[PDB]
């Protein structure tokens, strides 16, 4: 999976930097203003960002980004100001400072729900970066920014690590993998997106059926309705008309869920004996979210087996879609279709860049108009000193 280098227009980034003012004046002006506890504009910090020329200068910016998040005008962070800091990071580091700010979403609050996620991902790919690529993909899911047509690119590299992972996952790992596949998987056009949705459902069903349901939706934008296993069977019931599926990784993971539950029920001392942290605390703090009328998910295991067993045989008769090539079929999506989608955002990139240019002129003329207004008022006040 690769992204074409066509979406690299550093010439436009050249025109973004237009202020060209010394950082000592900007840093001193805002530090004095913050000591007075007085609001500051997004223009001042943006000028500080646009005048970055060293890695030490970026550390000053991220410190000021942290303090501007605690400024009274934190919500007024312009899209381009975050974007400019991304480009400055991509010149020198491109690996650590951008990810660290994204890891501390609350403290800094850059939140770049733009094409820069693809640009940040693309440079990770061009440097053969995997461990950090997974983390930034997860944090995109937290911001749920899988909206652009190029969302296929993000969907690919999650599936790449699915092949590469051979490990007994943990409580958080299973939840993250399902969340990073369920919501990002939206390509009804392709069967690979449908397979990922089934794969994500099975992971959440393992999470829900084994320990609990509350932590599935605690920190992530998921649905708190129970019964995720029954939410995956309906997808396999949609194949009555839809002729495309992955069905390779979905069946393998469903069998793993089937194997785990078929041993958990008869062997309580083997699979259900793992939880041994606290007994008195758990009982006292136990919260029962489900009602009495709601059927227990444990009692739905025979119901799940009866429906699941018949469905798999039926789909093979007419679906005609059983292959592991989804690793390569999805790979060719970005190598061929994405360049067209890459050109789709080229014009949009100009539009967003042009809008930022208009706002910067508007912001600069806004400040200048009041600057002469203040001095005209000040000169008039001193010329005719009238006070009560």
């Amino acid at each position: 999976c690769l992204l074409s280098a066509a979406y690299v227009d550093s010439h436009k980034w050249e025109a973004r930097d237009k202020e060209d003012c010394h950082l000592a004046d900007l840093a001193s002006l805002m530090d004095k203003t913050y000591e007075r506890k007085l609001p500051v504009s997004s223009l001042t910090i943006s000028r500080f960002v646009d005048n970055i020329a060293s890695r030490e200068d970026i550390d000053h910016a991220e410190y000021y980004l942290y303090k501007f998040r605690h400024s009274p005008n934190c919500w007024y962070l312009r899209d381009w100001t975050i974007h400019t800091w991304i480009r400055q990071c991509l010149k020198y580091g491109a690996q650590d400072k951008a990810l660290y700010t994204l890891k501390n979403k609350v403290q800094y609050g850059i939140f770049p729900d733009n094409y820069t996620f693809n640009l940040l991902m693309d440079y990770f790919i061009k440097k053969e970066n995997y461990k950090d690529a997974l983390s930034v993909v997860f944090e995109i899911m937290m911001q749920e920014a899988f909206e652009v047509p190029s969302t296929q690119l993000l969907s690919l590299y999650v599936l790449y690590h699915c092949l590469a992972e051979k490990t007994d996952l943990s409580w958080e790992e299973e939840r993250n993998f399902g969340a990073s596949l369920l919501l990002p998987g939206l390509k009804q056009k392709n069967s690979v997106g449908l397979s990922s949705q089934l794969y994500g459902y099975a992971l959440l069903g393992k999470v829900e059926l084994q320990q609990g349901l509350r932590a599935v939706y605690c920190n992530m934008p998921l649905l708190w309705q129970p019964g995720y296993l029954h939410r995956a069977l309906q997808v396999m019931e949609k194949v009555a008309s839809s002729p495309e599926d992955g069905q390779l990784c979905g069946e393998a993971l469903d069998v793993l869920d089937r194997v785990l539950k078929a041993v958990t029920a008869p062997a309580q001392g083997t699979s259900e004996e793992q939880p041994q942290e606290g007994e008195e605390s758990q009982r006292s703090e136990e919260l029962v979210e489900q009602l009495d009328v709601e059927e227990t998910e444990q009692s739905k295991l025979p119901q799940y087996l009866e429906r699941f067993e018949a469905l798999r045989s039926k789909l093979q008769a007419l679906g005609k879609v059983e292959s592991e090539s989804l690793l390569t079929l999805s790979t060719q999506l970005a190598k061929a279709q994405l360049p067209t989608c890459e050109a789709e955002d080229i014009a949009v990139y100009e539009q967003r860049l042009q809008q930022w240019h208009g706002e910067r002129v508007r912001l600069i003329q806004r400040e200048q108009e009041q600057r002469e207004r203040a001095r005209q008022d000040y000169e008039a006040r001193r010329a005719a000193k009238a006070s009560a």
Binding site: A24, E62, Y63, Q107
Partner: peptide
Amino acid sequence: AFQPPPKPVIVDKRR
């Protein structure tokens, strides 16, 4: 646990 960044110095010797 998040640790706030230390206070840096942005004064330049040029001026």
